[PDB]
Amino acid sequence: TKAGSLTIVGTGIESIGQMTLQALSYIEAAAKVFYCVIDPATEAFILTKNKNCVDLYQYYDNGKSRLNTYTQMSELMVREVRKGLDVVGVFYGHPGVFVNPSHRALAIAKSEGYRARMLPGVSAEDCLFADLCIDPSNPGCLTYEASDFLIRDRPVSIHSHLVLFQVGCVGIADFNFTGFDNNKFGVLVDRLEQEYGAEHPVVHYIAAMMPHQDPVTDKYTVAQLREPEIAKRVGGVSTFYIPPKARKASNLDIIRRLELLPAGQVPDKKARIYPANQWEPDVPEVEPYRPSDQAAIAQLADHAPPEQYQPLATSKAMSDVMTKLALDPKALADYKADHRAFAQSVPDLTPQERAALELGDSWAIRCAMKNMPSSLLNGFPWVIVEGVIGVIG
């Protein structure tokens, strides 16, 4: 009902390319854009997309409490919302991951009755999984802010992934344009030594911020983080990844209750699905082509789509409108305001395509765009299986 909206979007980490299509489309549609980005190529890119941009980075200052900066950044965005403008806030990475002012501005906007939405983006942790070739699923992931990790004595699991953000500003509440003397870094290393031992690997991770750069994926021992030459390499964009030290055994009660029953058949806790985490100390070599793998590959020769497989069967007109709804926020708002009026003005839709848009139901749109076989009559693509379940079945 109320005039004025706040949409907060991300740029991702790597310059320009890690922005989502929808983030770009909201930046272009905005009446005003407020941005806080790392790299000048992303900044320049944003300014080519909207004529009314404000750099939020100017509200940092030497010795200025970051909390005061964040209150100011939030208020600049919400002031424009209250004047009835469609406002877009733009932050580095995912705009909600280790970001104070986005959450603050969205909560204020929401509480005063304005439309308020955060669109997800690619985080430094998303980059970490991709560059270190690890899956948070295998074997679970603990993610902490490094100072919070220490002050609140957050628990570590030696059996799961550990990721630490803001390791380059331990205990630091303020800002400095030339970066920080991270003098309390030794307090973090002491905790890592207690939890994992002095010989356990820590990966210094820096995602490439420009398209031509390589990531930093430097493995050090906990002990090596005490060498002054190495400690000095940790900066404001540094993240730590600590791999598991050991593998956790199966709970026989759960094995029974999940009927993975022939107990002898459950893989040894040391048995891995290819590939193994290469960062783990004493990483055993895992066979990519076991007899089960070779037999599955042998079946490819005679493979045909199962009877229940639903081939795409759509039209340019339907693909075009579904693309427009994703990439044109004004078209989306019009559609959400009046499904029927919008659907009836789309040129070249089949009667089924028109009907499907009029309803808006997932099922109607899926039947309109996929041939549903008689054999078949939500989505079900699971692309991971836990090893003990997989190897048994």
Add this chain to the structure above:
Amino acid sequence: TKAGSLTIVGTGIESIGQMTLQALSYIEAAAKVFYCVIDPATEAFILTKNKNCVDLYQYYDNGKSRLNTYTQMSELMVREVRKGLDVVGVFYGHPGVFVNPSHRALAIAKSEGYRARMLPGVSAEDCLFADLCIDPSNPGCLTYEASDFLIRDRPVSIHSHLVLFQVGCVGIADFNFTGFDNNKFGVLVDRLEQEYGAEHPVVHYIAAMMPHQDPVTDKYTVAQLREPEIAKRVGGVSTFYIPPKARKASNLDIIRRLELLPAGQVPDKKARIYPANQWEPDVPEVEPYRPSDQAAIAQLADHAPPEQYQPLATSKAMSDVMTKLALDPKALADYKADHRAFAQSVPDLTPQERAALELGDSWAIRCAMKNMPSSLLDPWVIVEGVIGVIGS
């Protein structure tokens, strides 16, 4: 050196719009595209961008081990890599987050000496943070596969976020086109009851997969997950978010070693930065405009950029080439092959812009594109988070 490459990219969760610009650019540049997506609008979008696409979803079947499907998906991609083609694999969300065949195909390609890269994408957990309006930083985040959670008895922290994926197929190794009777769901609820109590909230989260849909953000008690009508709502795209039950106290030793020293000034462990996590039980209302907030806002009237602030000062030619390097993988490969030849063929660059590209160094490119004031010269600095005890 070797002909043939594997790039694995994501589509994000919400149809089309949550694909990154670089994922799209690799899908367009590929010799062959293998995709596994949820929604037909994303599938149709991909097929308009490349003429040589294969749907990997056809390798699932009723009663067929998902592990066998994943071996087949991986091998289809690596076979094309081995024949010297630039292959792009496309998976929904982040292609490395709860995805077996991406990691497998990349490891095989890498081990046989081919170029192999995963590009990050927007995960269901990225969507969860955005839609539930929570920050994994406040107060830390534990992320598990629901079956792994149970079988390996993974630890919970009652003080931090808990996220559980694949809650709709507990203990299930196979596939069914019509979905599953999630009959072992009650085993997960038993564990959540032990760890948090029967009254503690669990958020049933489903990200909107189409641009017009609303997310499902339904809060239930652990006990309510036992009602058959509610348990039945949990499906293949369901994720659980379990909020913290309590707030963790500060370690006085670390307070001393980090010189947050005037101990009386450290906020009560109950004190929160606005806003509070709305999903927490007994969430105390937090004042958005404290006297400190009002004083910071009062300072906006007389605000000027600090002297050390670096205004953007670039050219169309330089912004164009930096955009081309991000959005044109063939232009990027050419640049990476020969900085100098590439830099010297870019039209309309200033001598500084040309020199900066020739070197490739971050600093050279930053000076070329930003006015660095004398005050600054006498590292990338962008910290958008501060925890409560430090900040106050």
